[PDB]
């Protein structure tokens, strides 16, 4: 049944290198869903962060339709290995490092619906650059993003659109694997840009990170007040015993330096 349906699709003249055709000759519309699994290693020095996500792409390829109306055949067919399908050559413009997960078996999912609609899911671990602004350092908020666009296909061939309902989703155990920050807000936008090789469609998901204060309260502010207050207890020593006063003022001052370093 399923293996037969796959046979019927590739027994004909199908080329996985050819962009899927369109009714009005328009571009291929690729709907994108994104599931953030974990957001970790938020490096402030190299201004970047790590994040593992499940990318989900969906486009129509009338060449792969097998059931059309169906209603007698399976709604969709899981694409087995050895069958090539044109896929959006999407990449992450601000990715500095990336890994697909292929343990035991590649972590991918491809479905070919009867109407030709294709679902593509894959696990990806990224290390994206996130320019950070530390004007308010201790109590700051940063906005990090994941950009997603086609590399070779221009605006006439491929166009990205965020899924209509809940384009960005977060796994439940995300905020619990992110101890140092608090993911306050997320947004889903477009970043289509005009380059020297053409105009390329682009999506941009954005997360807002609020730095946890408890640490800086206990490791910076509290101990500094405690340090400044100690410098005051020398105002109560007789003016004759200056060795005691100096020892206090100097020590607290030196310590203040170390803490800052």
């Amino acid at each position, epitope marked *: 049944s399923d293996s037969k349906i796959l046979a019927h699709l590739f027994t004909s003249g199908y080329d996985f290198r050819v962009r899927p055709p369109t*009714d009005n000759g328009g571009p291929v519309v690729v709907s994108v869903n994104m599931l953030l699994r974990t957001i970790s290693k938020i490096d402030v020095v190299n201004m970047e962060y790590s994040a593992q996500l499940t990318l989900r792409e969906s486009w129509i390829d009338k060449r792969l339709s097998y059931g059309v109306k169906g209603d007698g055949q399976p709604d969709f067919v899981i694409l087995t290995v050895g069958h090539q399908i044109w896929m959006p050559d999407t990449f992450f413009p601000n990715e500095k490092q990336a890994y697909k997960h292929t343990i035991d078996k590649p972590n991918v999912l491809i479905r070919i619906h009867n109407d030709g609609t294709v679902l593509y899911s894959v696990r990806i671990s990224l290390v994206l650059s996130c320019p950070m602004y530390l004007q308010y350092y201790p109590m700051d908020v940063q906005q990090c993003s994941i950009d997603l666009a086609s590399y070779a296909y221009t605006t006439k061939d491929i166009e990205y659109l965020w899924k209509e309902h809940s384009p960005l989703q977060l796994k439940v155990g995300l905020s619990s694997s992110l101890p140092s920050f608090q993911l306050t807000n997320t947004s889903t936008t477009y970043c*289509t840009s005009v380059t020297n090789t053409g105009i390329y469609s682009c999506l941009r998901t954005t997360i807002q990170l609020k730095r946890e204060f408890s640490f800086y309260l206990l490791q910076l502010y509290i101990p500094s007040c405690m340090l400044v207050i100690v410098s005051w207890v020398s105002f109560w020593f007789d003016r004759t015993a200056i060795p005691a006063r100096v020892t206090l003022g100097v020590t607290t001052l030196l310590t203040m330096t170390a803490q800052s370093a």
Partner: antibody, heavy 122, light 110 residues
Framework: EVQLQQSGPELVRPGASMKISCKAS????????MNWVKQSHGKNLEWIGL????????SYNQKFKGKATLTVDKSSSTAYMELLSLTSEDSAVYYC???????????????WGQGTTLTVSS | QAVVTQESALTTSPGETVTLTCRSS?????????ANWVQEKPDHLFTGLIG???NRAPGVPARFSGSLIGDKAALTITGAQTEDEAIYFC?????????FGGGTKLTVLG
């Protein structure tokens, strides 16, 4: 406030070629890409093409491929448009319309120019 | 090739709600057409209203709003004003270029 001031009206003979300008002020010029629209008495509004000031990159309407040449002078914050092999059909008002988004293509129009009336007659 | 169609003209009184429409000849106006709306006041004064995904130009009054009613792009002025009387051009994005419509001459009665 942003402004797009284009060159004055021009009269030129067929076969010749002239270049109209569009001096931008009131915004970071190199941030928003420029469109060029042609309004003729005979037809509707036509989209000629667009150029990214920061990039130098251009994209033309197939119709005006070779008829128009979009350039940009960053120093003077001016966008130029060459028109070649001018004919009777090129007699129109040419507007320059800025794109909306900051350092990215948004595909929507912000401000236009007052327009430049080009008359090609013999 | 592809042709954009608009109402030749429309009429409305100050305060009422009028709707202009933008029709695609190849089919339904979808989000990848990035329906744009442009206003032309007398003496060749052009300015953008709506466009892109659901972006609007700086300063565009709240009364102006875009939508995809039916299978064409809409431009709804809720609470029309006297100064709203102008010519409205809508443009659809087909693959790699813009196509404008014939424009609609909206008249606010006086």
């Amino acid at each position: 406030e942003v402004q797009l001031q284009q060159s004055g009206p021009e009269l030129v003979r067929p076969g010749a070629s002239m270049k109209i300008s569009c001096k931008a002020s009131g915004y970071s010029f190199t941030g928003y890409t420029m469109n060029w629209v042609k309004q003729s008495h005979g037809k509707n509004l036509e989209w000629i093409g667009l150029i990214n000031p920061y990039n130098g990159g251009t994209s033309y309407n197939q119709k005006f491929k070779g008829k128009a040449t979009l350039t940009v002078d960053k120093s003077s914050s001016t966008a130029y448009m060459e028109l070649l092999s001018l004919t009777s059909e090129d007699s129109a008002v040419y507007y320059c319309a800025r794109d909306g988004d900051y350092y990215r293509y948004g595909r929507y129009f912000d401000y236009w120019g007052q327009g430049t009336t080009l008359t090609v007659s013999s | 090739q592809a042709v954009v169609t608009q109402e030749s003209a429309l009429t409305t009184s100050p305060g009422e709600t009028v709707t202009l429409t933008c029709r695609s000849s190849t089919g339904a106006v979808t989000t990848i057409n990035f329906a744009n709306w442009v206003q032309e006041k007398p003496d060749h004064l052009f300015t953008g209203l709506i466009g892109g995904i659901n972006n609007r130009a700086p300063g565009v009054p709240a009364r102006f709003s875009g939508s995809l009613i039916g299978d064409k792009a809409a431009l709804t002025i809720t609470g029309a004003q006297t100064e709203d009387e102008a010519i409205y051009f809508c443009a659809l994005w087909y693959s790699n270029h813009w196509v404008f419509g014939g424009g609609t001459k909206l008249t606010v009665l006086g």
